[PDB]
Design an enzyme around this catalytic site. Structure first.
Site, mmCIF file in Angstrom:
data_model
loop_
_atom_site.group_PDB
_atom_site.id
_atom_site.type_symbol
_atom_site.label_atom_id
_atom_site.label_comp_id
_atom_site.label_asym_id
_atom_site.label_seq_id
_atom_site.Cartn_x
_atom_site.Cartn_y
_atom_site.Cartn_z
ATOM 1 C CG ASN A 43 -2.069 -1.119 0.932
ATOM 2 O OD1 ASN A 43 -1.993 -1.792 0.085
ATOM 3 N ND2 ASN A 43 -2.931 -1.065 2.097
ATOM 4 C CD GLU A 64 -2.977 19.651 -21.338
ATOM 5 O OE1 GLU A 64 -3.560 20.977 -20.862
ATOM 6 O OE2 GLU A 64 -1.557 19.868 -21.544
#
Ligand SMILES: Nc1nc2c(ncn2[C@@H]2O[C@H](COP(=O)(O)OP(=O)(O)OP(=O)(O)O)[C@@H](O)[C@H]2O)c(=O)[nH]1
Ligand SMILES: Nc1nc2c(ncn2[C@@H]2O[C@H](COP(=O)(O)OP(=O)(O)O)[C@@H](O)[C@H]2O)c(=O)[nH]1
Ligand SMILES: [Ca+2]
Ligand SMILES: [Mg+2]
Ligand SMILES: [Mg+2]
Ligand SMILES: [Mg+2]
Lengths: 67, 440, 422
Positions: free
Chosen positions: B228, B254
């Site tokens: 994690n 974008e």
């Protein structure tokens, strides 16, 4: 040109609404069907269990008609 | 404006959430009580970190996040642990009984009982936003909640928030740390039902992360905690453009324009570097060129597959820390003069670059060396479909004998849903073949 | 969350008693119900099996049942005998006399409702009941006949909860009672329809282990029972301590039961008290360590759960679990990928540095059922002792029906054994 601009944005609205509407209806269908299916699974279990009971009474009754 | 709401679903979702939010706090200078001394506007603001944190009048910086799980023991650790003051209690939602590794229970039997409440709480977060951009949803493929509750939630979010963006971080199963035989079922069911409701999904193959931890950080037997922490660095790299400002900064949206050529083809491959121990990093400065080179080593990918045997449709490099374009450009030129980077014939071959100057951070007591510069590459490669192929094959093995299917049918599902999900997956693998074939 | 425990008949109450003594010690609960342990891992999931009463007391969520009052006097006088809730003792006065029909249809049925009242009281107080575990033998009369009645009765009222049994299969090596194959087959008939997961605790296997492996000339029920409690502790560890794998009855079933009827597990244990992780691993897969008298090399595994306990290298455990699968690949069905799950718990059982418990869903379990069936038929074809059963009201048809169902079960385990991926 303005007429066309107006049609493009109304088209975008219509398709987004139609997507929402169809997501909404597909989910309600799936949840309805799931609910019925599960309930029918549990109902069949109980009916089977209740025939077991039915059958045990019938057994005790036969022991009595033997004594 | 531009707020992003994170939703962490089930154990994997929640525990990865813990790691990410701890990391964000450290990156931004937020204490575990939520105070941020550097922030001079009390009780609100339009700073970049505000996309992920709201603020109370008392100066607390509160994650725009909901944690949901159908049993309480994982979220109970958040409620009682180090960042307990970070979250308002209503942001942490739990049931009493989990989905028992069964998609049907997560989507229907158990999930249906908490879904309205979850949406209520998400709505409370949305109402505090002036320009919500969308959601980031974290979850396992393999768990009953991660699979079935996530699907239900995504379906409901499309209805309630229209086309507002929904991005996933999806934990793909590996045998080393998986906990259910039926994970392939859950994975296919959730991938099928979520596919039309997600704009972009970053798969994280637990086996890839596991291997990287074993091999690059010398961890004998990685735990979720090891996995994690590394996942969080990758997640942080992908979201940094939303949380920091900068002249050379390029918005995730974008990159997304370039990453998604068709709605269904929305699964970027993430590759991250450098992952190196403190021991190895000491007196060893990895240059822009070295970390960029590392992006094209398959061992560093978050999903096991071979891009050298597929075709690219986009390549994006997200740099952070001490990095300038001159060095990036030179690094890229070299890589082109030496690598199996083949694009489909209908896509431009230019690499898209963003640079966030804020250097990477590490959590105290962690495995990663603190480094001066890091990079996450996001590529759209046909090779990612190998991950679907491996999963689809495991599904086929079992489904052919209808192994374990009675567990789902007993919760109200039909075989028809299995075949329908599997066919959608067959069509997706076919989609990935088609987009790689040359134009006529 | 909560499990409700029911023990029926002599065997059930005896192995049930040992179970509570053994896990009480593991959780640091003394005979008075007070906690006196050293680790918070002991208390974290304590409510799975214990109710918490006033005085910081812990009361097994346990229900003690028999048609014979004697057993629950002996229980009451056992070491942890004062730990059980007095109102949770439900005893008749009659006896079953090893007559399944008496336990199931007549005597047992007369007592069943009072038992339900107790189950209901315990279930109503549960925050979120998981389901039930029952201990009983299949060869006697109460545990077998009344025990299976209870199951079906409980299922009617908790149809959506998991029903788990620890069921002791009869062996001539341990009991000469001639009608036991009748009682066992009639039982299996019930279990096949009404339990989600059954541990086959086979007296045949238990005797053989005590005699051959442990070199005990004359095994007592004590000797057998030491094996049973060790096994029971092991196969419930994932329920009782913090952990990831099979941490509740439903997740266990979802991992272990690929076809609803095929829910009869072969448990196993190592070491069996003339130790490394490779050694542990090899033995837990050895037929000599199985608590069901079946050779797993005579069939294939549908699914397996392995549980390691003690301080050891998880790296080594993983490598060795991979090793056995690779080297014995033929014996795991290819059409269930990754069908072997492994858990490691830090806390070892009492008296051991480390141990392994094994839970297999093997098609070789048919050897057990075939053995009962052989003994059933030897008798039924001579209608031996039937009047005992017809005398309580049953008819021959039910006998035939039970035998056919069990025969079907065998055919089904054989079907999947023969199945292939291609
Ligand atoms: N990387 C990572 N994977 C995890 C973590 N926790 C669980 N997993 C993986 O997630 C899958 C299991 O799903 P979970 O998230 O635990 O289950 P769940 O969503 O809580 O669903 P239910 O328990 O069935 O209600 C397996 O593939 C695990 O290996 C974690 O903290 N990190
Ligand atoms: N392993 C084991 N088996 C037992 C024990 N007590 C009885 N049995 C077996 O159970 C069967 C007889 O059933 P029993 O439990 O005594 O009768 P019940 O009281 O009517 O349920 C026989 O096959 C016995 O060998 C015990 O303590 N341990
Ligand atoms: Ca501010
Ligand atoms: Mg869970
Ligand atoms: Mg008896
Ligand atoms: Mg006896």
């Amino acid at each position: 040109k303005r007429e066309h601009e107006r049609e493009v944005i109304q088209k975008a609205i219509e398709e987004n609404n139609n997507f929402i509407k169809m997501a909404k209806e597909k989910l309600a269908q799936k949840m309805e069907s799931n609910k019925e299916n599960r309930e029918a699974h549990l109902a069949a279990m109980l009916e089977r269990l209740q025939e077991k009971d039915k059958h045990a009474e019938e057994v005790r009754k036969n022991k009595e008609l033997k004594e | 404006m531009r707020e992003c709401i994170s939703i962490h679903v089930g154990q994997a979702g929640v525990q990865i959430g813990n790691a990410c939010w701890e990391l964000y706090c450290l990156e931004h200078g937020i204490q575990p009580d939520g105070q941020m001394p550097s922030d001079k506007t009390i009780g609100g603001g339009d700073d970049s970190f505000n996309t992920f944190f709201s603020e109370t009048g008392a100066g607390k910086h509160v994650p725009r996040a909901v944690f949901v799980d159908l049993e309480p023991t994982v979220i109970d650790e958040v409620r009682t642990g180090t960042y307990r003051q970070l979250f308002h209690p209503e942001q942490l939602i739990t049931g009493k009984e989990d989905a028992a590794n069964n998609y049907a229970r997560g989507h229907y039997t158990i999930g249906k009982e908490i879904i309205d409440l979850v949406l209520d709480r998400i709505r409370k977060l949305a109402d505090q936003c002036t320009g919500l951009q969308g959601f980031l949803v974290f979850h396992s493929f393999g768990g009953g909640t991660g699979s079935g509750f996530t699907s239900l939630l995504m379906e409901r979010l499309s209805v309630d928030y229209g086309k507002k963006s929904k991005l996933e971080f999806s934990i793909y199963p590996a045998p080393q740390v998986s906990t259910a035989v039926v994970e392939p079922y859950n994975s296919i069911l959730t991938t099928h039902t979520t596919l039309e409701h997600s704009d972009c999904a970053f798969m994280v193959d637990n086996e890839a992360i596991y291997d990287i931890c074993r091999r690059n950080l010398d961890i004998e037997r990685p735990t979720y905690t090891n996995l994690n922490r590394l996942i969080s660095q990758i997640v942080s790299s992908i979201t940094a453009s939303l949380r920091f400002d900068g002249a050379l900064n390029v918005d995730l949206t974008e990159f997304q324009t370039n990453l998604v050529p068709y709605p269904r083809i929305h699964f970027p491959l993430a590759t991250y570097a450098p992952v190196i121990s403190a021991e190895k990093a000491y007196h060893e400065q990895l240059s822009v060129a070295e970390i960029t080179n590392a992006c094209f080593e398959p061992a560093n990918q978050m999903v096991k597959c071979d891009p050298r045997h597929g075709k690219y449709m986009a390549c994006c490099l997200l740099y952070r820390g001490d990095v300038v374009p001159k060095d990036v450009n030179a690094a890229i030129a070299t890589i082109k003069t030496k690598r199996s980077i083949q694009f489909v014939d209908w896509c431009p071959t230019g690499f898209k670059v963003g640079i966030n100057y804020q250097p990477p951070t590490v959590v105290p007591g962690g495995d990663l060396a603190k480094v001066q510069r890091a990079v996450c590459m996001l590529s759209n490669t046909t090779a990612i479909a190998e991950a679907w192929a491996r999963l689809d094959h495991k599904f086929d093995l079992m489904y052919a004998k209808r192994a374990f299917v009675h567990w789902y049918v007993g919760e109200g599902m039909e075989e028809g849903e299995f075949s329908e999900a599997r066919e959608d997956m067959a069509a997706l693998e076919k989609d990935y073949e088609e987009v790689g074939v040359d134009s006529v | 969350r909560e499990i409700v425990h029911i023990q029926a008949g002599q065997c059930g109450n005896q192995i049930g008693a040992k179970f509570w003594e053994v896990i009480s010690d593991e959780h640091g609960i003394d005979p008075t119900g007070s906690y006196h342990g050293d680790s918070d891992l002991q208390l974290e999931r304590i409510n799975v099996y214990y109710n918490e009463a006033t005085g910081n007391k812990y009361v097994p969520r346990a229900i003690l049942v028999d048609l014979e009052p004697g057993t629950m006097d002996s229980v009451r006088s056992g070491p942890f005998g004062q730990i059980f809730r007095p109102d949770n003792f439900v005893f008749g006065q009659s006896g079953a006399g090893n007559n399944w029909a008496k336990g199931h249809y007549t005597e047992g049925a007369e007592l069943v409702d009072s038992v339900l009242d107790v189950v209901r009281k315990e279930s109503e107080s549960c925050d979120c009941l998981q389901g039930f575990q029952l201990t009983h033998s299949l060869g006697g009369g109460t545990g077998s006949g009344m025990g299976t009645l209870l199951i079906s009765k409980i299922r009617e009222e908790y149809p959506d909860r998991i029903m788990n049994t620890f069921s002791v299969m009869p062996s001539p090596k341990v009991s000469d009672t001639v009608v036991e194959p009748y009682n066992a087959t009639l039982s299996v008939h019930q279990l096949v329809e009404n339990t989600d997961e059954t541990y086959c605790i086979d007296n045949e296997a238990l005797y053989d282990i005590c005699f051959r492996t442990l070199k005990l000339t004359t095994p007592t029920y004590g000797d057998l029972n030491h094996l049973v409690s060790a096994t029971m502790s092991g196969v419930t560890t994932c329920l009782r301590f913090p952990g990831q794998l099979n941490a509740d009855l439903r997740k266990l079933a979802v991992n272990m039961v690929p076809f609803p009827r095929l829910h009869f597990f072969m448990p196993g244990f190592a070491p069996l008290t003339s130790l490394t992780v490779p050694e542990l691993t090899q033995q837990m897969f050895d037929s000599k360590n199985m608590m069901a008298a079946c050779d797993p090399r005579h069939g294939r595994y549908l699914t397996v759960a392995a549980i390691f306990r003690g301080r050891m290298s998880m790296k080594e455990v993983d490598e060795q679990m991979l090793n056995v699968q690779n080297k014995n690949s033929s014996y795991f069905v290819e059409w269930i990928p990754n069908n072997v799950k492994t858990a490691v718990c830090d806390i070892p059982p009492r008296g051991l540095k480390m141990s392994a418990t094994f839970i297999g869903n093997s098609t070789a379990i048919q050897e057990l059922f075939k053995r009962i069936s052989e003994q059933f038929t030897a008798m039924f074809r001579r209608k031996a002792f039937l009047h005992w059963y017809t005398g309580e009201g049953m008819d021959e048809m039910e006998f035939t029906e039970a035998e056919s169902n069990m025969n079907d079960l065998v055919s089904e385990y054989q079907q999947y054994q023969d199945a292939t991926a291609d």
